[PDB]
């Protein structure tokens, strides 16, 4: 439920790292960053950090996927103008 | 008066421990007090993937309980469009009536799901089914205030003017 991170799988030469962060974490451009014991920090890369309306937990989580779909993934919107009759 | 522990999964979307007790106990469509399997909980909830699991593992898409609210009834109800069309998919009957005769057009056109109703008409649901008091589909829209339901009701060849058993029509 925090920012954690556990090795779902490997082999000799590679680790396959599952990282969560919190459903109230800052959203924004983030660096990911890897410390080991005796060595500098190195960068591991950048990733950004949006809101949630998938996850039951986070503020603006949406009951429908339909909903979700249309108020969120949806680019092809329409504003409706004119007069209350027409 | 605590839920059986496939609910209290189904609720929550936990497909790793819904496996664990399908796995220890094989029956998915386990009741409750009130008589609803977990199948009802997830299309309460528009939980997908437990519903998949539980569709998959043997459980009745056309579930009835005593009140006749079928898993399709809720999912009408609630708005939840994909739980909707997996129910359809997997074999969910379209003019079956709860205990005050209710399809699941009645519940979805009582709140206002265009999409719902649509998905419903085109998979042959009754336009013209009556519940106890004669209503109608578009009686419930236009007792709800929704403009677009009854919109595309009056599309789908509605009767604008069907009666109730008080005589009263949509207007
Ligand atoms: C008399 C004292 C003892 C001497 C013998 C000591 C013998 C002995 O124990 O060797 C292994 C040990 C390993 O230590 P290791 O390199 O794993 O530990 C890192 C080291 O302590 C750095 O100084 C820390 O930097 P900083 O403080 O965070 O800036 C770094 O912090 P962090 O990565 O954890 O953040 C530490 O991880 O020490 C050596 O480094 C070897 C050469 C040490 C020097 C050899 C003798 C000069």
Same mark, same amino acid.
């Given at each position: 439920?925090?920012?954690?991170?556990?090795?779902?799988?490997?082999?000799?030469?590679?680790?396959?790292?599952?990282?969560?962060?919190?459903?109230?974490?800052?959203?924004?451009?983030?660096?990911?960053?890897?410390?080991?014991?005796?060595?500098?920090?190195?960068?591991?890369?950048?990733?950004?950090?949006?809101?949630?309306?998938?996850?039951?937990?986070?503020?603006?989580?949406?009951?429908?996927?339909?909903?979700?779909?249309?108020?969120?993934?949806?680019?092809?919107?329409?504003?409706?103008?004119?007069?209350?009759?027409? | /008066? @605590? *839920?059986?522990?496939?609910?209290? %999964?189904?609720?929550?979307?936990? =497909?790793?421990?819904?496996?664990?007790? !399908?796995?220890?106990?094989?029956?998915?469509?386990?009741?409750?007090?009130?008589?609803?399997?977990?199948?009802?909980?997830?299309?309460?909830?528009?939980?997908?993937?437990?519903?998949?699991?539980?569709?998959?593992?043997?459980?009745?898409?056309?579930?009835?309980?005593?009140?006749?609210?079928?898993?399709?009834?809720?999912?009408?109800?609630?708005?939840?469009?994909?739980? /909707? @069309? *997996?129910?359809?998919?997997?074999? %969910?009957?379209?003019?079956?009536? =709860?205990?005050?005769?209710?399809?699941? !057009?009645?519940?979805?056109?009582?709140?206002?799901?265009?999409?719902?109703?649509?998905?419903?008409?085109?998979?042959?649901?009754?336009?013209?089914?009556?519940?106890?008091?004669?209503?109608?589909?578009?009686?419930?829209?236009?007792?709800?205030?929704?403009?677009?339901?009854?919109?595309?009701?009056?599309?789908?060849?509605?009767?604008?003017?069907?009666?109730?058993?008080?005589?009263?029509?949509?207007?």
């Amino acid at each position: 439920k925090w920012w954690s991170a556990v090795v779902e799988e490997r082999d000799a030469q590679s680790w396959t790292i599952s990282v969560t962060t919190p459903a109230d974490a800052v959203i924004g451009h983030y660096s990911l960053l890897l410390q080991v014991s005796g060595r500098k920090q190195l960068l591991l890369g950048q990733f950004t950090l949006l809101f949630n309306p998938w996850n039951r937990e986070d503020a603006v989580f949406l009951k429908n996927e339909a909903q979700r779909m249309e108020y969120l993934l949806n680019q092809n919107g329409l504003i409706y103008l004119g007069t209350a009759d027409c | /008066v @605590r *839920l059986p522990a496939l609910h209290i %999964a189904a609720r929550n979307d936990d =497909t790793r421990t819904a496996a664990v007790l !399908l796995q220890n106990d094989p029956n998915p469509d386990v009741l409750s007090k009130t008589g609803f399997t977990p199948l009802h909980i997830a299309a309460h909830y528009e939980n997908l993937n437990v519903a998949q699991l539980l569709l998959n593992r043997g459980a009745s898409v056309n579930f009835t309980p005593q009140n006749g609210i079928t898993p399709l009834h809720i999912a009408s109800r609630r708005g939840n469009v994909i739980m /909707v @069309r *997996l129910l359809l998919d997997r074999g %969910a009957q379209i003019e079956t009536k =709860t205990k005050d005769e209710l399809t699941p !057009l009645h519940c979805a056109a009582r709140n206002g799901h265009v999409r719902i109703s649509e998905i419903l008409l085109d998979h042959g649901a009754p336009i013209q089914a009556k519940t106890k008091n004669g209503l109608s589909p578009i009686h419930m829209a236009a007792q709800g205030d929704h403009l677009d339901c009854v919109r595309l009701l009056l599309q789908y060849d509605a009767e604008i003017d069907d009666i109730t058993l008080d005589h009263l029509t949509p207007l």
